Amino acid sequence: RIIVDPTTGKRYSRGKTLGKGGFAKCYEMTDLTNNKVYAAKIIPHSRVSKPHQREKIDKEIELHRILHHKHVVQFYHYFEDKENIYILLEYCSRRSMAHILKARKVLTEPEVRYYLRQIVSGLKYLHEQEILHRDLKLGNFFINESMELKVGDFGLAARLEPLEHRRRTICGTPNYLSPEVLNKQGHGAESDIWALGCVMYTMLLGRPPFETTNLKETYRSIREARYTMPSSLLAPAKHLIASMLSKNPEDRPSLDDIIRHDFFTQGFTPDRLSSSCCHTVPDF
Numbered sequence: 062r063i064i065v066d067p068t069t070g071k072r073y074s075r076g077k078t079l080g081k082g083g084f085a086k087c088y089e090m091t092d093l094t095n096n097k098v099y100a101a102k103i104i105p106h107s108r109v110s111k112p113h114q115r116e117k118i119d120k121e122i123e124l125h126r127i128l129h130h131k132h133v134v135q136f137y138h139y140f141e142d143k144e145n146i147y148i149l150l151e152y153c154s155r156r157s158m159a160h161i162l163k164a165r166k167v168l169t170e171p172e173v174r175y176y177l178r179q180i181v182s183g184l185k186y187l188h189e190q191e192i193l194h195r196d197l198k199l200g201n202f203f204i205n206e207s208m209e210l211k212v213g214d215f216g217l218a219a220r221l222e223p224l225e226h227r228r229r230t231i232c233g234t235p236n237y238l239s240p241e242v243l244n245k246q247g248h249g250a251e252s253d254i255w256a257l258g259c260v261m262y263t264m265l266l267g268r269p270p271f272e273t274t275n276l277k278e279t280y281r282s283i284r285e286a287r288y289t290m291p292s293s294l295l296a297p298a299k300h301l302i303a304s305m306l307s308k309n310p311e312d313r314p315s316l317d318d319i320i321r322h323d324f325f326t327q328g329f330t331p332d333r334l335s336s337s338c339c340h341t342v343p344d345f
């Protein structure tokens with residue numbers, strides 16, 4: 062099916078569906094004037110009839126469209142017609158880390174380093190733009206044909222705010238509540254670091270350190286920041302976790318500290334991961 066941008070003339074061809082993405086039905090979409098394929102979110106205006114949800118996509122678009130980095134999903138273009146909003150994004154043929162971890166249960170340490178370095182690279186870029194991601198999770202780490210990771214889905218993302226004027230209410234329903242957010246202190250860069258600690262734990266163990274139901278009954282455990290540290294973890298992995306999930310956000314490492322931790326520096330990390338790793342545990 063041909064889709065024409067009524068503002069420009071520009072023609073696109075819609076391919077196969079890629080699945081549901083919240084407000085969006087997602088599809089392959091080819092720009093006919095370079096012949097490049099994008100992963101597109103197609104959102105009917107009906108799904109955004111309320112002013113707040115209209116503001117929600119507008120914000121996502123506004124923030125995403127200015128980002129350009131190798132480990133951030135590349136925003137291509139957006140337009141609207143009478144029926145839909147179209148957001149064309151970098152096509153990532155190997156799905157997400159959520160799909161990979163579902164298949165693998167647990168990843169090897171060199172793989173954890175491989176993926177984490179790339180997450181840190183993209184997050185660094187974001188934090189220097191003073192943009193907070195606010196929903197870092199495995200499902201938002203998109204993987205391309207060449208096994209390269211891109212951080213995406215900027216649907217809870219916001220610009221950084223000083224504590225004195227900051228939003229103190231929970232924004233959306235993220236995968237990993239910090240202590241500070243649960244203490245009504247709002248979400249800072251350190252809250253993304255939380256969230257990375259939770260990610261690393263999950264990559265190595267296959268389950269999160271705290272419940273992810275976001276039920277009020279879970280709040281005390283998180284805000285204590287007391288959890289099980291399984292013995293199966295190697296010492297450096299344990300130590301790095303342990304710092305990222307510091308109770309006081311001020312005690313958590315910087316992004317530069319994180320990639321220079323013994324967990325990264327004292328182990329093998331290979332330059333390129335094979336696609337078999339979506340599948341099968343790699344060779345020693």
Ligand SMILES: CC[C@@H]1C(=O)N(C)c2cnc(-c3ccc[nH]3)nc2N1C1CCCC1
Binds near residue numbers: 079081151152153203
């Ligand atoms: C468009 C939303 C999300 C996404 O944000 N990107 C960048 C993406 C890239 N490639 C793909 C992709 C290429 C081949 C299959 N999916 N998918 C992406 N998704 C999916 C679509 C359905 C749920 C999340």
